[PDB]
Amino acid sequence: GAMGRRLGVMGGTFDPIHYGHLVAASEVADLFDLDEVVFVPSGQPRQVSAAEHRYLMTVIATASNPRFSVSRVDIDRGGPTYTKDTLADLHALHPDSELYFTTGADALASIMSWQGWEELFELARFVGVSRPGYELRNEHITSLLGQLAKDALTLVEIPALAISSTDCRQRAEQSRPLWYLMPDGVVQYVSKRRLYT
């Protein structure tokens, strides 16, 4: 892009993926002049749907966008997902790109608290996304994340993240419509495979 080779890495369980995630990816790509956003469904952790389901929904959701792709690195590694391993794996595939690891602000707080912050900032820049008013509801998480990272971490508020996977699962459970919360292909996957019933 305008600032050199840059790759977004959208880490999440994606159970299910929804337009909130897709809007967040689009926003972060625009904000940081990213060339591509790679969606990386996380390993098995509630019990999340089987990995292949979450992979396929993400493939279906992102297929039409030339600037989105999906990586199996976390689901195929085996065992729990450590963001250091995700980033190590993607650096090896894209050694000439700066990595921008993107996930929910709550998850970013967990990653940074025990994963090994200093080694993480060697591998990537970090982007935490949330619904608006995150800083107001989480004063101290926000300021602590800011102190640790400085220029390497950025928090971004996305109105469309009012759409949550938790709400989508409940809608599916209750047979309420998922139309226009996610692509029809994902609505149908959820329906066809009976995911949250």
> By the criterion CB under 8 A, which residues form the site for a copy of itself?
19, 22-23, 26-27, 29-30, 65, 131-133, 159-164, 167, 176-177, 179-181
154 binds ligand NAP (CB under 6 A): no
Please state whether beta strands 98-104 and 6-12 pair in parallel, antiparallel, or not at all (unpaired): parallel
Cβ 172 to ligand NAP shortest distance, Å = 14
Closest to 41 measured CA to CA, from 60, 27, 66, 23: 60
DSSP letter at 127 equals E
Site string for Cl ion, 96-115 (x = CB under 5 A): xx------------------
Give burial (CB, 10 Å; 0-12/13-18/19+) of 144: middle
Tokens of 32: 């940081």
φ/ψ bin of 99: left (φ > 0), alpha (ψ from -120 to 50), beta (otherwise): beta
CA angle 111, 117, 123 (to 5 degrees): 95
Of 25-33, 90-98, 111-119, 185-193, the window that binds Cl ion (rule: CB under 5 A) is 90-98
Which residue in 7, 8, 12, 34 binds ligand NAP (CB under 6 A)? 12
Residue ranges binding ligand NAP (CB under 6 A): 10-13, 20-21, 24, 42, 45, 81-83, 102-104, 106-107, 110-111, 115, 129, 161, 164-166
Q: Summarize as ranges the residues that interact with Cl ion (CB under 5 A).
A: 94, 96-97
